[PDB]
Amino acid sequence: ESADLRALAKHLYDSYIKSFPLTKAKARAILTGKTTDKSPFVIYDMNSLMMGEDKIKEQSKEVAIRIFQGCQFRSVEAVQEITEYAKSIPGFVNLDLNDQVTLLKYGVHEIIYTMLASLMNKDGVLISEGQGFMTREFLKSLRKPFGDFMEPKFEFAVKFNALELDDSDLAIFIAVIILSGDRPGLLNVKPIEDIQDNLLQALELQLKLNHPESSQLFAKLLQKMTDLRQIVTEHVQLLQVIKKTETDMSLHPLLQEIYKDLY
Amino acid sequence: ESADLRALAKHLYDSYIKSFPLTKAKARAILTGKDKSPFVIYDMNSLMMGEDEVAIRIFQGCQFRSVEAVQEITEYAKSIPGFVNLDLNDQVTLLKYGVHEIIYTMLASLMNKDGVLISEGQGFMTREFLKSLRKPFGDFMEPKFEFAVKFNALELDDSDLAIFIAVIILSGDRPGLLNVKPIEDIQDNLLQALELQLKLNHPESSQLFAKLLQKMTDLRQIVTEHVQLLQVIKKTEHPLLQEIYKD
Numbered sequence: 001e002s003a004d005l006r007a008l009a010k011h012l013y014d015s016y017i018k019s020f021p022l023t024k025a026k027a028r029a030i031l032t033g034k035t036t037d038k039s040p041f042v043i044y045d046m047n048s049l050m051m052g053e054d055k056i057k058e059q060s061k062e063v064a065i066r067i068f069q070g071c072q073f074r075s076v077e078a079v080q081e082i083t084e085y086a087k088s089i090p091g092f093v094n095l096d097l098n099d100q101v102t103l104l105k106y107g108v109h110e111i112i113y114t115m116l117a118s119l120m121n122k123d124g125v126l127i128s129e130g131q132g133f134m135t136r137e138f139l140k141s142l143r144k145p146f147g148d149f150m151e152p153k154f155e156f157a158v159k160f161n162a163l164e165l166d167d168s169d170l171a172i173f174i175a176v177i178i179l180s181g182d183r184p185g186l187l188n189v190k191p192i193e194d195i196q197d198n199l200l201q202a203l204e205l206q207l208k209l210n211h212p213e214s215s216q217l218f219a220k221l222l223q224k225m226t227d228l229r230q231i232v233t234e235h236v237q238l239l240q241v242i243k244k245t246e247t248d249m250s251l252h253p254l255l256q257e258i259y260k261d262l263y
Numbered sequence: 264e265s266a267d268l269r270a271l272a273k274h275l276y277d278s279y280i281k282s283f284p285l286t287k288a289k290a291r292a293i294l295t296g297k298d299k300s301p302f303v304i305y306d307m308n309s310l311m312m313g314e315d316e317v318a319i320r321i322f323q324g325c326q327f328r329s330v331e332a333v334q335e336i337t338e339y340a341k342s343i344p345g346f347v348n349l350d351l352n353d354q355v356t357l358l359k360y361g362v363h364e365i366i367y368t369m370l371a372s373l374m375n376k377d378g379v380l381i382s383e384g385q386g387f388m389t390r391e392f393l394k395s396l397r398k399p400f401g402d403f404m405e406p407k408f409e410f411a412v413k414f415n416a417l418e419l420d421d422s423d424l425a426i427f428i429a430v431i432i433l434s435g436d437r438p439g440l441l442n443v444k445p446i447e448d449i450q451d452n453l454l455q456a457l458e459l460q461l462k463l464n465h466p467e468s469s470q471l472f473a474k475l476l477q478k479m480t481d482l483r484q485i486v487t488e489h490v491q492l493l494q495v496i497k498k499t500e501h502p503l504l505q506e507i508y509k510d
């Protein structure tokens with residue numbers, strides 16, 4: 001049985017590399033020391049954003065918004081990536097189509113914030129496929145309320161990154177996130193938990209093998225799932241505010257569908 | 264050691280029985296069948312008879328009992344190996360944020376699809392009578408019921424709940440903690456005992472351990488949801504009484 005799980009772990013890590021251009025291993029390399037060819041351009045203020053805009057997508061107003069539409073572009077691209085990955089999870093495409101949609105609807109942002117921690121450190125976040133690095137302080141100072149988006153993600157990334165996970169661990173765990181039978185509105189819950197049950201078993205074996213001297217990483221990792229949940233709810237509120245105060249900004253149909261009647 | 268955990272598990276169960284009068288085994292006997300039938304509160308008349316506006320007096324009985332549960336829980340928490348040896352401000356902080364979660368976890372023992380055992384198991388208030396309360400209060404306990412039904416589906420017994428409760432208390436991410444290390448260290452022994460307990464007592468349920476930890480999220484969401492409901496009652500709400508229940 002160990003063998004079957006080991007194979008599933010291998011399978012998932014494989015689809016993970018194929019589905020995501022910027023892995024956590026690559027992100028760490030850039031963030032730390034391969035500083036010569038992989039060194040990012042840093043954006044810490046109003047002006048550097050323009051100086052560096054060569055690789056990116058009332059000054060305050062415009063700026064706070066160029067970043068907004070920028071996160072939106074990347075978001076939709078991330079969704080598309082996560083959707084591609086989901087199809088590789090054994091069993092996922094054989095489920096009721098309606099449920100596939102429902103697992104993605106509530107699963108995608110939870111996955112997005114998890115993997116986004118891979119791109120963050122105490123001081124900031126990699127942007128533009130690793131080529132850029134926007135500082136935490138700059139983001140926290142954008143025109144109000146656009147400055148309240150990122151802090152709670154940074155707060156999580158810092159904690160979650162303390163678990164020292166690598167992509168092979170991440171691949172299984174984000175699959176476990178997706179295959180959650182507790183998502184509101186699912187039709188056939190039993191087929192979904194039968195799969196998740198197998199995924200957790202893979203994650204438990206994987207975690208014991210990769211982090212032997214890390215007592216209850218499996219349990220600690222599972223509890224982090226309450227942190228992501230809280231981050232999307234707080235997030236949704238943030239967006240509802242913006243759609244009223246900024247009636248000129250458009251949401252992308254893909255993100256709009258995800259959010260519509262979510263919780 | 265695989266036997267140090269079985270000791271700890273055993274220890275908590277004994278303490279848990281000592282600390283909470285109405286166990287799950289005992290509430291399950293009363294909710295399904297086993298003679299001295301509890302008094303049913305299914306409508307306005309059965310209520311005032313059971314005693315032997317209304318929307319309000321009912322919500323405040325839950326508060327009264329919550330205040331009781333909080334004392335039963337802290338008394339229990341102090342028997343958890345290592346808890347008492349933690350910085351006093353932290354013990355207060357853990358209990359402060361953990362009681363609501365532990366309160367729902369246990370209320371689900373006194374619950375089923377159609378009602379909740381009230382008053383030490385003497386009563387039983389129908390889900391319907393509660394769902395049908397005034398404009399604010401009719402949606403009060405309904406969220407707890409949906410949780411209960413889902414959580415009860417795991418079929419945990421008191422011996423499991425006792426360790427699971429301990430784990431909740433020793434949550435190392437409570438806001439304002441001063442020394443997290445020891446808290447998480449304790450939770451690890453607790454998580455180790457909970458895993459071994461579930462594998463031995465529930466061999467067929469493959470990842471019950473994991474299913475149970477995922478419920479801690481459903482739980483936090485129900486508490487954040489309850490708190491925001493206490494907001495709405497306040498902004499639409501006896502001095503010493505107010506003090507006993509300040510929260």
Ligand SMILES: CCCc1cc2c(=O)n(C)oc2c(CCC)c1O[C@H](C(=O)[O-])c1ccc(C(C)C)cc1
Nearest residue numbers: 064067068071072074075078112116146149150153
């Ligand atoms: C972690 C970034 C969160 C995020 C940050 C910002 C921000 O600073 N501005 C100015 O607008 C934002 C939006 C709204 C986009 C419509 C965000 O939420 C997006 C969403 O709600 O989808 C989003 C966009 C990109 C990403 C990538 C980093 C994966 C994640 C979330």
